[PDB]
Ligand binder design. Structure first.
Ligand code: HEA
Ligand code: HEA
Ligand code: DMU
Ligand code: DMU
Ligand code: DMU
Ligand code: DMU
Ligand code: DMU
Ligand code: DMU
Ligand code: TRD
Ligand code: TRD
Ligand code: TRD
Ligand code: TRD
Ligand code: TRD
Ligand code: TRD
Ligand code: TRD
Ligand code: TRD
Ligand code: TRD
Ligand code: TRD
Ligand code: TRD
Ligand code: CA
Ligand code: CU
Ligand code: CU
Ligand code: CU
Ligand code: MG
Ligand code: OH
Lengths: 259, 539
């Protein structure tokens, strides 16, 4: 079966695994910025703790009177500027790569509804809706139950994927450029998949684009990311990334043969 | 002679109005903090155990008490609307009715005139009206919670920023009440701002030149300008929501030719300045406090003034960093990213200047100083995660997750709020005539320090793991850090109840203040030359 990859893990402190070149760039850039901001924070903290230890009233009974130090005041304006410029230098190329939409191998149009997602593959004339396993649409009321657990198991999951798993998945071929066009039907929703490094608001009246190329097969989950009412917590996203051949098989399963 | 209502609520004196804003801000603070305890009760464990739809069929009172005890999942039908209402209530109360009234309306009204040698505000009756508009706004925000709202229940579950079409489609009139509350808060802030500006410019004491004005009064002056530009823009944004809801307009409705994203631009044009309006008066307080307890004058007085001015101005040209995923062009994203990054420079000047103020001093670790030192460290933690978030490429991942929540609670609840406590402990002797017990101030500090860090630091982890904002429930893998966060919230709440006990004791049994200046000679601003409490009519 498919490996569950794009999901949170117990006690996790880092990003979800990367499954796209874009997600990998985010991981690298955030790792870079984190080292810098940790250094800064540790620096500021050590300076404070030192000053308190060194110039505590029981140690230094006579305070100084200076209110200026030009060499230092220049250095602590200029150095933050350099650091920010360094961050920008690495950050802008990543941003440009994220937001420049390449040519699509697969095109999917996604619509956010209260409270579920609709998917259309215009090249394939496929259209379907995707509800949380446990949603009222599937007979539930947004909580775990013996039926919901059985439903999760039948669909290839476990009770651990509750709130992530949907009844239908957006299926795509591995190593192909997928362009997703996102809009909202009623209020604003937001479509995202952490493993791919993508997120785009689903705004009524607007069609926005994002892209990803998945680099391994498996199952990847996201969750609606703009508050949209009572079931905001209960309209997740499942993307299954499969072989070119398994993707065709899934397309044919949707093909109607009317005479 | 004067009854309690006349003595206090009818007073037009800046010191009395200041005290009214402080107590009220503290009371609304307690309410909003209580909401968060309940929030964190529900987030302690995956599955919904408290916010059950079954509690709606009982009364309002018995339904309330039922809500506080955990149910089995199989007996609890999740009610996402209650979650959304609590979250919205907590946020609106904090942002409009707690921290700014405490810092600007409270310490601002009290100390700014004292600091510049003014006997009162330019318009004392306007100042009194500002307070009443504040209370009226608070009353409406609170009333919205019990008014017909979304999903055939009570209350608005729309987020503190009221995004349409959600906010314009929410059923009932609870949302309209929240809009009116925000209008009344806005008016309150504008009236306050008119007073601060007129007083600061026209009523300084003989010899009190602009470059001799103390830093807190500067912080209040800068804050008032931001209010004048930011708050009328908000009044526009929300009036448009009200007309889309009630008067047939389609500003944000695509069917009528509108655009939901237009609201966001107008909203965040207020929404970013809003947070600098919050934190500037806290910068001011920290300056006075560090200088006093390091027994050393403030390092770089003029850069300190100009840094706050630069922060205030820059705060107006960065708003779309709240909109990176809302459909902004790559050009807009790049600009707003780079503009936002610039803010770290003047802010760093202040952080470094405060450390340089301590440097070579004679540092006394009294309670007010502990709060200021905590501020330096904790506001830095929050500020740097702000810079992370300004990177649109990384924000793609973090936006609408708990990493953002971690960011803003570090700068607000471990920053601005540490500023509030710094000021309270610094000035309670001066305002009341009674001093707080030192050991209890210190216990408060340490309980809050440990508790608030346990609450919010793990939210960074939750955000990196991809936990979204505004969720009643979450996937099981998020259990560990949610549980830790909740324990932190409960300890933090204990510290706050303790604090309220400290204030009660102080004001009833606290050692009487016997000196105009009960600190030291480096508390060198005008309030320290007056009695404790200052006379009814000063100067
Ligand atoms: C007190 C209130 C306050 C303050 C002061 C700030 C300050 C800052 N904020 Fe924050 N913020 C909020 C409250 C606040 N914020 C709130 C409430 C939200 C959420 C709104 C919502 O959606 O509900 C939010 C959200 C928010 C976002 C949107 C995130 C998202 O929704 O995806 C962004 C984007 O850039 C951001 C950035 C910043 C930055 C760069 C700063 C800067 O001002 C910080 C500068 C300070 C430092 C950088 C530290 C000290 C400096 C140094 C030690 C110098 C050296 C440092 C470097 C060289 C980096 N904030
Ligand atoms: C000043 C700003 C402020 C403060 C102080 C707090 C305090 C707290 N907040 Fe809040 N928070 C917000 C502003 C603030 N919050 C906003 C705007 C949102 C967004 C809502 C939305 O998404 O729409 C939010 C959202 C928010 C969430 C996310 C909800 C969600 O996305 O589903 C959570 C989750 O745990 C949370 C928890 C807490 C906790 C546990 C505390 C506290 O319990 C921490 C402990 C602190 C104390 C015990 C001291 C408090 C002291 C004062 C407030 C001063 C009182 C005044 C005087 C004494 C004069 N808050
Ligand atoms: O300034 C901008 O810096 C970008 C630096 O990222 C350049 O993007 C250039 O470099 C990027 C490298 O990631 C490419 O994605 C872009 O297509 C290419 O225009 C871009 O021209 C330039 O004006
Ligand atoms: C062999 C002996 C056979 C005897 C059969 C008759 C006894 C039946 C009693 C069942 O016990 C009930 O369990 C509920 C569920 O635990 C409790 O609800 C309470 O606790 C729940 C926790 O899940 C809440 O949801 C409810 O609202 C709250 O009323 C309820 O009070 C309690 O009486
Ligand atoms: C000074 C201020 C103090 C603030 C007040 C603090 C209140 C905290 C008490 C919460 O009570 C706990 O709630 C859990 C639910 O979150 C329960 O989890 C247990 O029971 C649930 C069923 O109700 C299951 O779903 C859970 O998996 C299981 O861990 C647990 O038993 C219960 O004791
Ligand atoms: C980036 C670091 C930020 C933290 C700031 C802490 C360092 C402050 C040291 C100030 O330097 C002082 O300058 C005075 C006048 O120039 C000197 O008087 C002679 C004094 O002896 C010296 O110590
Ligand atoms: C929980 C909120 C924390 C707010 C703390 C603010 C404390 C300020 C108290 C000032 O009250 C004073 O009380 C005195 C008699 O007691 C009066 O004489 C004096 O005029 C008045 O100003
Ligand atoms: O527990 C309190 O511990 C304090 C000690 O940390 C005690 O204060 C005691 O000790 C203080 C000095 O630490 C004195 O100021 C107080 O008068 C004295 O009651 C108290 O009572 O409750
Ligand atoms: C692989 C990631 C593990 C490291 C987790 C630490 C992230 C916490 C960021 C908070 C920023 C504090 C300044
Ligand atoms: C002198 C400016 C300080 C900027 C922080 C850099 C941290 C150095 C380690
Ligand atoms: C090409 C590098 C641009 C970096 C700009 C960052 C702005 C820092 C202030
Ligand atoms: C109506 C539910 C009760 C909410 C408790 C708030 C504290
Ligand atoms: C078996 C039920 C035990 C739950 C005890 C916790 C309830 C306390 C919450 C009140 C606040
Ligand atoms: C409008 C669909 C919401 C799902 C049911 C919520 C139960 C609350 C009563
Ligand atoms: C193309 C940059 C957008 C202009 C906004 C400035 C305020
Ligand atoms: C014996 C008291 C020591 C206090 C240490 C000061 C540090 C507190 C601020 C946190 C940084
Ligand atoms: C893995 C470190 C836990 C951090 C605790 C929050 C302070
Ligand atoms: C993880 C299962 C243990 C449940 C313990 C809940 C009690 C929390 C104590 C609240 C203070
Ligand atoms: C030095 C005298 C000690 C008096 C103790 C005052 C602290 C008040 C604690 C109140 C706790 C309320 C929950
Ligand atoms: Ca729960
Ligand atoms: Cu949604
Ligand atoms: Cu949603
Ligand atoms: Cu902002
Ligand atoms: Mg959003
Ligand atoms: O902001």
């Amino acid at each position: 079966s498919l490996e569950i990859i794009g999901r949170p893990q117990p006690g996790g402190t880092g990003f979800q695994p990367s499954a796209s070149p874009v997600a990998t760039q985010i991981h690298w850039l955030d790792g870079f910025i984190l080292v810098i901001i940790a250094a800064i924070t540790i620096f500021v903290t050590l300076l404070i703790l030192y000053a308190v230890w060194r110039f505590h009233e029981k140690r230094n009974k006579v305070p100084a009177r200076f209110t200026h130090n030009s060499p230092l005041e220049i250095a602590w304006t200029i150095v933050p500027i350099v650091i920010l410029v360094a961050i920008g230098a690495f950050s802008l190329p990543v941003l440009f790569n994220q937001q420049e939409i390449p040519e699509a191998d697969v095109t999917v149009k996604v619509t956010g509804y209260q409270w579920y997602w609709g998917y259309e593959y215009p090249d394939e004339e496929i259209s379907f809706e995707s509800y949380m396993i446990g949603s009222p649409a599937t007979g539930g009321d947004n909580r775990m139950s013996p039926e919901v657990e059985q439903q999760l198991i039948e669909a290839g999951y476990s009770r651990d994927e509750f709130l992530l798993a949907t009844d239908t998945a957006m299926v795509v071929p591995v190593n192909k450029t997928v362009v997703v066009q996102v809009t909202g039907a009623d209020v604003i929703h937001s479509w995202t998949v952490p493993a791919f490094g993508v997120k785009q608001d689903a705004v009524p009246g607007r069609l926005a684009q994002l892209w990803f190329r998945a680099e391994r097969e498996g199952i990847f989950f996201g969750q609606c990311s703009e508050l949209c009412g009572i079931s905001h917590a209960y309209m997740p996203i499942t993307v299954k990334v499969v072989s070119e051949e398994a993707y065709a098989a899934w397309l044919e399963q949707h093909h109607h043969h009317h005479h | 002679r004067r009854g309690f209502f006349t003595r206090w609520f009818m007073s037009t004196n800046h010191k009395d109005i200041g005290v009214l804003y402080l107590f009220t801000g503290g009371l609304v603070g307690l309410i909003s903090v209580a909401f968060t305890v309940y929030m964190r009760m529900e987030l302690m464990a995956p599955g919904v155990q408290f916010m059950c739809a079954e509690h709606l069929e009982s009364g309002l009172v018995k339904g309330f008490f039922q809500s506080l005890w955990p149910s089995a999942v199989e007996n609890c039908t999740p009610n996402g609307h209650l979650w959304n209402v609590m979250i919205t209530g907590h946020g609106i109360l904090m942002m409009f009715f707690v921290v700014i009234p405490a810092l600007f309306g409270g310490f601002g009204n009290y100390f700014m005139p004292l600091h510049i040698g003014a006997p009162d505000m330019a318009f004392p009756r306007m100042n009194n009206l500002s307070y009443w508009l504040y209370v009226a706004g608070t009353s409406l925000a609170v009333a919205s919670l019990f008014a017909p709202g979304g999903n055939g229940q009570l209350g608005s579950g729309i987020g503190w920023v009221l995004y349409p079409p959600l906010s314009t489609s929410e059923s009932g009139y609870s949302t309209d009440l929240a809009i009116f509350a925000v209008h009344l808060s806005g008016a309150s802030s504008i009236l306050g701002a008119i007073n601060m500006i007129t007083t600061f410019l026209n009523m300084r004491a003989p010899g009190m030149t602009m470059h001799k004005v103390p830093l807190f009064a500067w912080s209040i002056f800068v804050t008032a300008w931001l209010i004048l530009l930011a708050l009328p823009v908000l009044a526009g944004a929300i009036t448009m929501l009200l007309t889309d809801r009630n008067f047939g307009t389609t500003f944000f409705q695509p069917s009528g030719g509108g655009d939901p994203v237009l609201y966001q631009h107008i909203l965040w044009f207020f929404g970013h300045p809003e947070v600098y309006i919050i934190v500037l008066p806290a910068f001011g307080i920290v300056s006075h406090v560090i200088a006093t307890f390091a027994k050393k004058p403030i390092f770089g007085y003029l850069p300190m003034v100009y840094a706050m001015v630069a922060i205030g101005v820059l705060g107006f040209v960065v708003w779309a960093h709240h909109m990176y995923t809302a459909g902004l062009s790559l050009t807009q994203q790049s600009y707003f990213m780079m503009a936002t990054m610039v803010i770290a420079v003047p802010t760093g000047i202040k952080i470094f200047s405060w450390i340089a103020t301590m440097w070579g001093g004679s540092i006394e670790l009294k309670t007010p100083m502990l709060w200021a030192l905590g501020f330096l460290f904790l506001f830095t933690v929050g500020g740097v995660t702000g810079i992370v978030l300004s990177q649109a490429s990384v924000d793609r991942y973090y936006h609408d997750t708990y990493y953002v929540v971690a960011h803003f609670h570090y700068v607000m609840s471990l920053g601005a709020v540490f500023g509030i406590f710094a000021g309270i402990y610094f000035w309670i002797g001066k305002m009341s005539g009674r001093q707080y017990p030192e050991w209890a101030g210190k216990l408060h500090f340490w309980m809050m320090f440990v508790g608030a860090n346990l609450t919010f630091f793990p939210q960074h982890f939750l955000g990196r793991q991809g936990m979204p904002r505004r969720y009643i429930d979450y996937p099981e893998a998020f259990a560990t850090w949610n549980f830790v966060s909740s324990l932190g919230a409960f300890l933090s709440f204990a510290s706050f109840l303790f604090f309220l006990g400290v204030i009660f004791y102080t004001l009833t049994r606290g050692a009487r203040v016997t000196a105009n200046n009960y600190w030291n000679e480096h508390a060198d601003t005008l309030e320290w030359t007056l009695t404790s409490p200052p006379p009814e009519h000063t100067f």
